[PDB]
Amino acid sequence: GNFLKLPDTDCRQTPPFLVLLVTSSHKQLAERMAIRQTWGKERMVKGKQLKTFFLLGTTSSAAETKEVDQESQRHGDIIQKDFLDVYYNLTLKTMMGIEWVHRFCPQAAFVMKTDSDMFINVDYLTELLLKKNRTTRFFTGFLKLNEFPIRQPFSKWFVSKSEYPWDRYPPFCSGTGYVFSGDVASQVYNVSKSVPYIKLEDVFVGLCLERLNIRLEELHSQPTFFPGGLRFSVCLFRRIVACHFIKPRTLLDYWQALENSRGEDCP
Numbered sequence: 001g002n003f004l005k006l007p008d009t010d011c012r013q014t015p016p017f018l019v020l021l022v023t024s025s026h027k028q029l030a031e032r033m034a035i036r037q038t039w040g041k042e043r044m045v046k047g048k049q050l051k052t053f054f055l056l057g058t059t060s061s062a063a064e065t066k067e068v069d070q071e072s073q074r075h076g077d078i079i080q081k082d083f084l085d086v087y088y089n090l091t092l093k094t095m096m097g098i099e100w101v102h103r104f105c106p107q108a109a110f111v112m113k114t115d116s117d118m119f120i121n122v123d124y125l126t127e128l129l130l131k132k133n134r135t136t137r138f139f140t141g142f143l144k145l146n147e148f149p150i151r152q153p154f155s156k157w158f159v160s161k162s163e164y165p166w167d168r169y170p171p172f173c174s175g176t177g178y179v180f181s182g183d184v185a186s187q188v189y190n191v192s193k194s195v196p197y198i199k200l201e202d203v204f205v206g207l208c209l210e211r212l213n214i215r216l217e218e219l220h221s222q223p224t225f226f227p228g229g230l231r232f233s234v235c236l237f238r239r240i241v242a243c244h245f246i247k248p249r250t251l252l253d254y255w256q257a258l259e260n261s262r263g264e265d266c267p
Ligand SMILES: *[C@@H]1O[C@H](CO)[C@@H](O[C@@H]2O[C@H](CO)[C@@H](O)[C@H](O)[C@H]2NC(C)=O)[C@H](O)[C@H]1NC(C)=O
Pocket: 082, 083, 084, 085, 086, 088, 089, 092
């Protein structure tokens, strides 16, 4: 599928239970390292394999290119295709990850597309997935069901009426972090080229899901995805899946906190 970089993995020999696909720009090496030492550390969670890969495009900068090439050689966890890695190309990045799942890891039980400014509790997510008994046509996260396109011309998320001509967006989940059974990736890739393009990646996935008649489901009876951020407590982060607004230094302090407090019980 025209991939410049592929992770050294074989999902047929060892079918992963959860695959994390993380978006980060080239210069965000600090974010990728913090994730690699924290929630992205590959391991067995309740006997289920967790794999973590980073989605990258390409950049004009030769320096950055070299750096990333070196990182791929040292880590072997980068998925890359030739597309200008900018905020308005995140739909290409997301479709790149979905294509990678479809071509090289269709065996994954579940896939999580996440951003790099985030805390992910994989242990609580794995537990909640094994309790849902939903292994096909499954898609969850922070559900956004009546969103209106931003028409403020200078907003980061402005879309003109030519880019998106309708009053409302389809049902979708925040791109901060969404999870789907591995089969959905193949369906989204197959229908992607026939769905009207939009530069907001989570909206675009929503348009595809709408085309495929796959409905959005809440993961749990309590909220577990927090795109707005949360006040930190070891007890709260033990009972959530994802939290946004987390810079790298903060991610390491939180992981040290949960590591320092393992063994303590919580109200
Ligand atoms: C997203 O990435 C694509 C692919 O790199 C960009 O399209 C190319 O843009 C470069 C310069 O930006 C041109 O030299 C090429 O002719 C374009 N090729 C293709 C395949 O279209 C595109 O511009 C990027 N989008 C944004 C918003 O920057």
